């Protein structure tokens, strides 16, 4: 089976999500043919030179899955678009493009974070265009770490002071551009399986969940497609009247 996750939004103030992700990497992921992380692995990223210990702890844990023989792949989210090749090397992950077409047991599947499908959020798309401009990334990454941390903290506060869903036509256009009947994405935090029509045939759009209270993954096998919700930790059973 091939596994997909997204929207973990890891951060040091949420240690329970980190613990659930480490348990996932130590168990379930080790049996996978491959693991794909479709963006928003981290709540924020200001560059690969950041000494945040959470970054090394996560890199080591992913690298152990890779060393155990499970290739791991990453598509950027809107939160963590600055993840680069230094972190790819540290973690053993392979960085992928904004859109990729995969062969999953004979089934053609498009994968992306999903924010580029949210063409009705013009203000998000304006932000995205700015922070994906190469000279703007190069300028930001040149700034001292402590300045970058101050900028990011301020920008997060400003944003906090509701993620828009995908545009249906943008979904059809992406699935027809790639001539696929299957699409897996995250970003909208609305886990679902949607049936639509693309390329003159039934088509499906599978959406991952955010890791709020529990984890979410999509498991693709040669036989089926599974959207799975599971607890972060091993909830031990323990023991009413008639």
Ligand X SMILES: CN(c1ccccc1C(=O)N1CCc2cc(S(=O)(=O)N3CCN(c4cc(C(F)(F)F)cc(Cl)n4)CC3)ccc21)S(C)(=O)=O
The correct pick among 5, 24, 58, 78 for binding Mn ion (CB under 5 A) is 78
9 labeled part of a ligand binding site = yes
CA 101 to CA 16: how far, in whole Å? 33
Say which DSSP state 116 is in. Answer: G
Least separation in angstroms between CB 18 and ligand X: 17
Helix (H) or strand (E) holding 36: strand 34-38
52 labeled part of a ligand binding site = no
Asked if 125 interacts with ligand X (CB under 6 A), we say no
Asked if 204 interacts with ligand X (CB under 6 A), we say no
24 binds, among ligand X, Mn ion, none (CB under 5 to 8 A by kind): none
Q: Are 149 and 46 in contact (CB under 8 A)?
A: yes
Neighbouring-strand partners of residue 95? 74
Q: Are 118 and 167 in contact (CB under 8 A)?
A: yes
120 labeled part of a ligand binding site = no
56 binds, among ligand X, Mn ion, none (CB under 5 to 8 A by kind): none
Q: Show the tokens assigned to 110.
A: 């498009």
Asked if 11 interacts with ligand X (CB under 6 A), we say no
Asked if 28 interacts with Mn ion (CB under 5 A), we say no
Asked if 52 interacts with ligand X (CB under 6 A), we say no
Which of 41/184 has CB closer to ligand X?
A: 41
Q: Are 220 and 104 in contact (CB under 8 A)?
A: yes
CA 10 to CA 16: how far, in whole Å? 10
Site residues, ligand X (CB under 6 A): 44-46, 78-79, 82, 123-124, 127, 131, 136-137, 140, 151-152, 155-156, 159, 163
């Amino acid at each position: 089976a091939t596994l997909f996750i997204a929207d973990l939004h890891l951060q040091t103030e949420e240690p329970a999500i980190t613990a659930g992700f480490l348990r996932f990497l130590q168990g379930e992921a080790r049996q996978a043919d491959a693991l794909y992380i479709l963006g928003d692995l981290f709540e924020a990223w200001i560059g690969d030179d950041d000494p945040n210990p959470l970054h090394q702890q996560i890199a080591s844990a992913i690298k152990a899955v890779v060393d155990a023989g499970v290739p791991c792949y990453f598509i950027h989210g809107n939160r963590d678009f600055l993840v680069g090749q230094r972190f790819a090397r540290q973690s053993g992950m392979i960085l992928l493009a904004e859109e990729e077409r995969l062969d999953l047991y004979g089934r053609e599947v498009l994968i992306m974070h999903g924010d580029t499908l949210c063409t009705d959020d013009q203000g998000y798309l304006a932000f995205r265009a700015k922070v994906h401009t190469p000279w703007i990334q190069r300028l930001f990454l040149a700034l001292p770490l402590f300045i970058r941390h101050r900028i990011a903290a301020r920008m997060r506060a400003d944003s906090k002071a509701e993620i828009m869903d995908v545009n249906p036509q943008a979904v059809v256009d992406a699935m027809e551009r790639h001539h696929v009947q299957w699409l897996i994405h995250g970003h909208t935090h609305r886990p679902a399986v949607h049936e639509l029509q693309a390329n003159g045939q039934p088509a499906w759009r599978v959406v991952l969940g955010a890791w709020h209270s529990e984890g979410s993954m999509v498991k693709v096998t040669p036989d089926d497609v599974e959207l799975i919700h599971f607890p972060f930790l091993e909830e031990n059973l323990y023991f009413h009247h008639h």
